């Protein structure tokens, strides 16, 4: 319902999130996924590491530069899931994929924009409590991603700035709420309440 939907990928069950996002792109919705390093996969970290190593051993025998490319970054792992669920060899699939951006952290274009979640892909809502799960950043680092520390540092900086922004917004919201609480017994407010507002 927005020109661009920014999904905060934190705790989002990579496969289910990828399914939602693939359908969204094919339906023509622009999607930006942020914080791909905080995505989750069901199963123990060792399980998912073994799965990625099974992926890693697959390569074109006569030329490894032809074989399947094993992207290590969490955004590219999520992108691999999405591409496997998009018909990426057609022009339609290509257009759908250009309707998508995936990032580690929340870079400057989107750190000041609203992030949404996908409840049908949320780990806390989908996974049975006590089921073990993996974090994409940890898995990616274990398989050779180099920027977990840089992403974490920039995320801490962004969180400091965003907490300051939210403190200001909370103060202003309290002011607006007080001003609406006053003049809530006015005739206009009573008529609005009668009409449901």
């Amino acid at each position: 319902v927005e020109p661009v939907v920014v999904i905060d990928g934190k705790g989002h069950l990579v496969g289910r999130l990828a399914s939602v996002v693939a359908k969204q792109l094919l339906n023509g919705q622009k999607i930006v996924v942020v914080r791909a390093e905080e995505l989750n996969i069901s199963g123990e970290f060792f399980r998912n590491k073994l799965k990625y190593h099974d992926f890693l051993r697959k390569a074109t025998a006569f030329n490894k530069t032809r074989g399947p490319f094993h992207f290590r970054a969490p955004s590219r792992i999520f992108y691999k899931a999405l591409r496997g669920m998009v018909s990426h060899k057609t022009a339609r699939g290509k257009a759908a994929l250009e309707r998508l951006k995936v990032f580690e952290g929340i870079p400057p274009p989107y750190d000041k924009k609203k992030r949404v979640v996908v409840p049908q892909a949320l780990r806390v809502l989908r996974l049975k409590p006590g089921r073990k799960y993996t974090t994409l950043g940890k898995l990616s680092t274990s398989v050779g991603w180099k920027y977990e520390d840089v992403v974490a540092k920039l995320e801490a900086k962004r969180k400091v700035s965003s907490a300051e922004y939210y403190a200001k917004k909370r103060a202003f919201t309290k002011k607006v709420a007080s001003a609406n609480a006053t003049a809530a017994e006015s005739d206009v407010a009573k008529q609005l309440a009668a009409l449901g507002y």
Binding site: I7, P119, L125
Partner: protein, 172 residues
């Protein structure tokens, strides 16, 4: 087979010149409809007595409704089922408000825990356990304690929309 009803089925073993008024055998059959109910009646009657549908007749078939469908009962259920390698009798206990609901639960549970399909299960008996402390299964006894209360932690709300703007909560 489906959401069950209970039927009384009374069959006759059709009269002859020598034996008019045969012995009128009755069964309580759990089945989704009267066709299955009569089929099941003939199945069990052929297991018990020298009769078949061709040599007998269905004298009556009547749905038996639960006497008190809105009171919670503990049921002892004796079943005989075929496993992959033999036949076994088991006794289970089900808490429910009607015999048909208890039998539906029993069939679900047999299929879930022993992979026993409908065809492999005979309901030997379903009986209300009138006196608690005659309930001998812990998974039913734990619901018969005084002032039973329990929370429902980790509530998961089903969203009507693809995207949420709230990062939901599982409080309850």
């Amino acid at each position: 087979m489906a959401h069950f009803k209970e039927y009384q089925v009374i069959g006759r073993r059709l009269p002859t010149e020598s034996v008019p008024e045969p012995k009128l055998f009755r069964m309580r059959i759990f089945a989704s409809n009267e066709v299955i109910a009569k089929s099941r009646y003939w199945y069990f009657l052929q297991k018990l007595h020298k009769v078949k549908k061709a040599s007998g007749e269905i004298v009556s078939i009547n749905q038996i409704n639960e006497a008190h469908p809105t009171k919670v009962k503990n049921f002892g259920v004796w079943v005989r089922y075929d496993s992959r390698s033999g036949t076994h009798n088991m006794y289970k206990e089900i808490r429910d408000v009607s015999r048909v609901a208890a039998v539906e639960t029993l069939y679900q549970d047999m299929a879930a825990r022993h992979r026993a399909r409908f065809r492999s299960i005979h309901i030997l008996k379903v009986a209300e356990i009138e006196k608690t402390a005659d309930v001998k299964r812990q998974y039913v006894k734990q619901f018969l304690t005084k002032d039973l209360k329990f929370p429902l932690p980790h509530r998961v709300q089903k969203s009507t929309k693809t995207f949420s703007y709230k990062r939901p909560s599982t409080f309850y």
